[PDB]
């Protein structure tokens with residue numbers, strides 16, 4: 001166990017507490033997710049599996065499990081703390097340089113880190129399943145950590161399609177094969193990365209396919225399957241030159257084997273820096 005006596009409460013954020021730690025080897029800031037002790041057994045099991053999965057994940061662009069406190073109650077997991085909250089709210093508060101304000105190159109450096117992060121996970125055959133800027137965190141100097149906050153935050157309910165007794169689905173980010181089968185792969189993670197790169201280039205000014213209903217997005221997935229010319233695509237954002245747009249379009253290839261691997265996507269977005 002990490003020692004509880006080394007976590008000095010700073011701020012609230014089942015609760016997430018901003019904390020600082022002296023001489024962990026400025027004091028180190030860490031984020032501490034605390035499971036309520038009235039927590040159900042299902043919730044406790046989920047928290048122990050979230051600990052198990054995070055434990056194996058060690059990359060500059062993925063949230064990092066720093067320590068746990070589980071031998072006693074309440075159950076604690078400790079991650080690194082990202083100062084600027086999730087990437088969706090962060091970019092929504094920004095505008096493209098001609099404020100605050102973010103240059104085009106910085107948008108690519110943001111996009112490349114998410115790609116470097118997905119690339120790491122692909123070397124483990126780890127499929128994210130719900131990649132989107134709302135699951136990315138921003139630290140200092142626009143460093144990006146992929147995370148997964150799950151599917152039940154009110155702020156983002158609209159990004160999820162729910163049917164009673166079914167898995168809740170982030171359909172507007174999902175590959176056509178996913179929408180039709182529940183079959184998630186690294187290749188489908190690539191598709192969702194294409195939609196994440198679209199969001200970043202939109203500086204998050206709109207939801208994908210936002211003028212179309214849930215049902216129309218599902219219908220669109222069927223048209224990729226039918227492949228008689230009726231499938232439609234996310235448009236090119238204002239900030240996006242046509243070359244970068246053509247990278248996004250490759251992410252939405254019908255055949256998952258024609259979609260770019262993350263190694264290549266990272267290589268191409270990291271080039272400008």
Ligand SMILES: CS(=O)(=O)N1CCC[C@H](NC(=O)[C@H](CCC2CCCCC2)NC(=O)c2ccc(CNC(=O)c3cnc4ccccn34)cc2)C1
Pocket residue numbers: 013016031032033049050053054057062063077079080081082083084085086121128137146147148149150151
């Ligand atoms: C297995 S599942 O698909 O069924 N399931 C569904 C429900 C969601 C589950 N997620 C998870 O397992 C991941 C496991 C890692 C994930 C990594 C990416 C690749 C896939 C795996 N848990 C988290 O992402 C996580 C995130 C933050 C924190 C605490 N730190 C903070 O909040 C924090 C830190 N800085 C700030 C700044 C502002 C506010 C808060 N913070 C704790 C956990 C997955």
